[PDB]
Amino acid sequence: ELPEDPKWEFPRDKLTLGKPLGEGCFGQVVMAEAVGIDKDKPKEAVTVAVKMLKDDATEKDLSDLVSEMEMMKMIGKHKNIIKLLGACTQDGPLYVIVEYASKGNLREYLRARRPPGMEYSYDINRVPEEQMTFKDLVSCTYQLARGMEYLASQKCIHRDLAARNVLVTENNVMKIADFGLARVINNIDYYKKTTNGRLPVKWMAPEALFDRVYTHQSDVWSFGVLMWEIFTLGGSPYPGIPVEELFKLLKEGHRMDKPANCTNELYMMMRDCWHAVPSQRPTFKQLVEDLDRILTLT
Ligand SMILES: */C=C\C(=O)N1CC[C@H](n2nc(C#Cc3cc(OC)cc(OC)c3)c3c(N)ncnc32)C1
């Protein structure tokens, strides 16, 4: 039983579901048309995305979808956070309606803009995409730092920051998404003492892996990995290294090598994000400032 939230509730008869968008990165999401959901244009039918439960959904899936919806209300509005548009919570299946990002997730967006002959390169709609420039990659990074700076200031830890969980709109705006694992924290480290092990290992800070704690500085570690993904145009981190072996390698101080499309400056930013001591990593505020400088110079 979900209590009504009138300000977010959207009528079912004004929503028309369409093609599936994929199930691998954000659960079951479908393209849809929502009549009058944009109150600036109240007559118009807007293309939206709708998250819903699969027929094989578990109790945890249901609880996770509700919690995700509530987190989106909590965090509030920002240019680089995927926007909640409404929900159908009464008298039928739970639908959460979010803004449509026509260019997919960041990993697919970057891989589609790789040069031909490179692994994972493909032409969307059998038509070649425009190449990424250096400026575009820095801009991408800047936007995501801004989004995470906002998220952290709302006292939220994401815990699953990765290119697969970033959405890209028609106007190439980066939107942080997938709040399945996100939590509101206080001022002290998030600690459970009970380990569920649902965090993607290759993006996790050592203190998350080993000490079972999470802070904003843990998200900074992940942001470093995201940076590496961006500058490798959607590369898979720790190339050729099994997830299983990374526990040992992190204890021995292993770090990824510099991407070729990366400047020495930006690689040092990555490496700073991967300081073993969390308090020695930059804050999102510092990352934004540094990236602002780099961007306005390029
Ligand atoms: C692994 C690739 C994959 O499955 N997809 C890539 C692009 C497809 N896609 N997913 C979304 C979304 C979403 C969403 C829904 C939420 O409901 C509570 C919450 C979110 O984060 C807080 C994100 C998507 C959108 N929105 N537009 C276009 N394609 C989309 C799936």
Residue 240, C-beta contacts closer than 8 angstroms, at least 6 positions apart: none
Question: From residue 48, how far is each of 2, 64, 65, 86 by CA, in Å?
Answer: 23, 21, 17, 10
Which part of the chain is CATH 3.30.200.20?
A: 12-99
Instruction: Check: CB of residue 129 under 8 Å from CB of residue 110.
Output: no
Which residues sit opposite 157 in a β-bridge? 183
Task: Look at residues 257, 277, 276, 275 and name the one whose alpha carbon lies nearest to residue 267.
Answer: 257
The one-letter amino acid at 184: V
Q: Please identify every residue annotated as catalytic.
A: 160
Task: Look at residues 80, 246, 71 and name the one whose alpha carbon lies nearest to residue 156.
Answer: 71
H helix and E strand count, the chain:
8, 11
- How far, in Å, is the centroid of ligand 1 from the Cα of 67? 16
Q: What is the DSSP string of 151-167?
A: HHHTTEE-S--SGGGEE
Task: Look at residues 147, 295, 290, 174 and name the one whose alpha carbon lies nearest to residue 230.
Answer: 174
Half-sphere exposure of 46 (CA within 13 A, CB side): 18
Residue 94, C-beta contacts closer than 8 angstroms, at least 6 positions apart: 2, 52, 53, 62, 65, 66, 87, 88
Residue 42 backbone class (left: φ over 0; alpha: ψ -120 to 50; beta: rest): alpha
> Which residue's alpha carbon is at the smallest distance from atom 8 of ligand 1?
21
Task: Look at residues 35, 54, 53 and name the one whose alpha carbon lies nearest to residue 45.
Answer: 35
Per this entry, what is the length of the chain? 298
Asked if residue 25 has its Cβ within 6 Å of ligand 1, the reply is: yes
Question: From residue 259, how far is each of 33, 73, 232, 237, 294 by CA, in Å?
Answer: 41, 37, 6, 11, 17
Question: From residue 181, how far is each of 69, 121, 165 by CA, in Å?
Answer: 12, 30, 12
The one-letter amino acid at 275: H
The one-letter amino acid at 193: K
Asked if residue 100 has its Cβ within 6 Å of ligand 1, the reply is: yes
Q: Which two tokens stand for residue 60?
A: 């945890």
Task: Look at residues 7, 8, 13, 31 and name the one whose alpha carbon lies nearest to residue 91.
Answer: 13
Q: Is 24 annotated as a binding residue?
A: yes
- Entry resolution (Å): 2.0
Which part of the chain is CATH 1.10.510.10?
A: 106-297
Q: What is the DSSP string of 31-74?
A: EEEEET-STTSTTSEEEEEEEE--TT--HHHHHHHHHHHHHHHH
Asked if residue 128 has its Cβ within 6 Å of ligand 1, the reply is: no
Q: Is 171 annotated as a binding residue?
A: no
Q: Which CATH class is domain 12-99?
A: alpha beta
Q: Is 76 annotated as a binding residue?
A: no
CATH topology for 106-297?
Transferase(Phosphotransferase); domain 1 (1.10.510)
Residue 210 phi, psi dihedral angles, 5° rounding: -105, -40
Residue spans of beta strands (DSSP E) within the chain: 15-22, 28-35, 45-52, 84-88, 95-99, 156-157, 166-168, 174-176, 183-184, 190-191, 213-214
Helix (H, G, I), strand (E, B) or coil at 265: helix
Residue 226 phi, psi dihedral angles, 5° rounding: -60, -45
Distance CA 272, CA 19 (A): 42
Sign of CA dihedral 246, 252, 257, 263: positive
Instruction: Check: CB of residue 177 under 8 Å from CB of residue 167.
Output: yes
Residue 68, C-beta contacts closer than 8 angstroms, at least 6 positions apart: 51, 96, 179, 180, 182
Asked if residue 116 has its Cβ within 6 Å of ligand 1, the reply is: no
